[PDB]
Homo-oligomer: A and B are copies of this chain.
């Protein structure tokens, strides 16, 4: 149990060093949560690779990344002009909120850690609750921390009191004897969330998360943005009426437009592979081209 735990702490040390450098001493519980620490260059997308979400993205910048990173500029404004202690991203599925979380992890650059539901659930008794202490202590040590819970229904409200204990301790250490620091700082740990079913999250997270951003479907020209964005590496040279494709996708979500673009791009490559499958070695270097075929 110690040798495997030693491998755990070694991998944690490597990951935390690669995060910090862009040292720390951790107990064996937060050497297991620090494995779920997302390095900055591990994300392929920034705020420029997202389309349609611009007012929400400026909200997340001006209220969640500036109040949480470089807070000295906000000493003039006082205390109310600061970052909340929790933000939520709700809306339909596929609309692009996990992508917002990914862009926040990449561009914000302040100790992002994504909590999976498995790291909160432990078979043994009690130690499934010390991991929440480890999460918050790690977020307090990695000072500009952004805790993230994707599909946030593990802290949703069989009860399984041990799981109830984990949820209650998460609520308590959310805003308890540590969320009101005498140093005039909340420690800058914004527990970002996300969920496509906003109703079932019962009451507590709805009061603990002041900012709640609805990621709608792209209405009438944000789908044009997502089309111009997904089709960034495909040769659409001869005749590709992008406005028609933006107008035909009536109520498709971002993932739906993305998969439609995937099919439309597979179309020329498919109809090329299906035609030159006779010379033996298929290469298919730059020969095909995109026209239509959504």
Contact = CB atoms under 8 A, between A and B. Distances in A.
B172 A286 contact: no
Interface in A154-172: 154-165, 167-169, 171-172
B157 A161 contact: yes
Contact of A207 (B203, B232, B253, B286): B253
B118 A123 contact: no
A46 B41 CA distance: 40
Given A123-B126, A125-B122, A163-B161, A76 B155 contact: no
How many copies the complex holds: the figure is: 5
Given A72-B284, A81-B266, A285-B76, A177 B98 contact: yes
Contacts of A43: 177-178, 180, 182
Main secondary structure of the interface of A (DSSP, over half): loop
Nearest to A281: B73
A74 interface: yes
A125 B120 CA distance: 10
A105 interface: yes
Interface string A246-284: 000000010110110111011001100110000001111
Interface stretch (A60-68, A218-226, A237-245): A60-68
B126 A232 contact: no
B82 A262 contact: yes
A122 B129 CA distance: 9
A24 interface: no
A17 interface: no
Contact-residue bracket for chain A: 35 or more
Interface in A113-136: 114, 116-118, 120-130, 132-133
A78 B123 contact: no
A79 B283 CA distance: 18
A67 B269 CA distance: 10
Contacts of A116: 129, 133, 169, 172-173
Interface in A140-159: 148, 150-151, 153-159
Contacts of A126: 118, 120-123, 128, 162
B94 A62 contact: no
Nearest to A114: B177
B183 A44 contact: yes
A102 B128 CA distance: 25
A199 to B, nearest CB: 12
Which of A168, A183, A282 lies at the interface centre, i.e. has the most chain B CB atoms within 10 A of its CB?
Answer: A168
16 contacts: A43-B178, A44-B79, A66-B270, A66-B273, A72-B283, A74-B284, A77-B265, A77-B269, A80-B261, A121-B126, A123-B126, A148-B177, A151-B168, A156-B164, A158-B160, A210-B262
CB-based closest 6 A-B pairs? A78-B233, A121-B126, A154-B168, A210-B259, A118-B129, A151-B168
